[PDB]
């Protein structure tokens, strides 16, 4: 049940930190 | 459904693992 | 749909793209 | 302890390598 | 096993690669 919001929650925040490396690697090669 | 929503994030992260890996291809080139 | 085997499906070509990125981080440490 | 609990502990650990990567990334770039 | 301990395996995977990479990385300031 909550869970399942907790795991939810937690690829969401994956989510952001990927969106983070991505944007510093574009910097990078840019 | 919190199942279709864990799925729909898990499709951003692949999609944004695609792009950190197409950046490093072109970091290594 | 079948939600659990996409869930699955996803998260192998997550782990073939991770796998390709440590590869090309092998050759940059190199 | 279940099977939705061991997945949230890997997902906590992959979150937690994640902001690793990103922290020194975020030294790289400067 | 069943499938919810198949996406776990995967999630395991995802893990260690992560790991790789980050020990890769550490290095730098390590």
Same mark, same amino acid.
């Given at each position: $049940? +909550?869970?399942?919001?907790?795991?939810? +929650?937690?690829?969401?925040? @994956?989510?952001? @930190?990927?969106?983070?490396?991505? +944007? @510093?690697?574009?910097?990078?090669? $840019?």
């Amino acid at each position: $049940g +909550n869970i399942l919001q907790k795991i939810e +929650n937690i690829l969401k925040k @994956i989510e952001n @930190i990927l969106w983070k490396i991505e +944007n @510093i690697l574009q910097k990078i090669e $840019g």
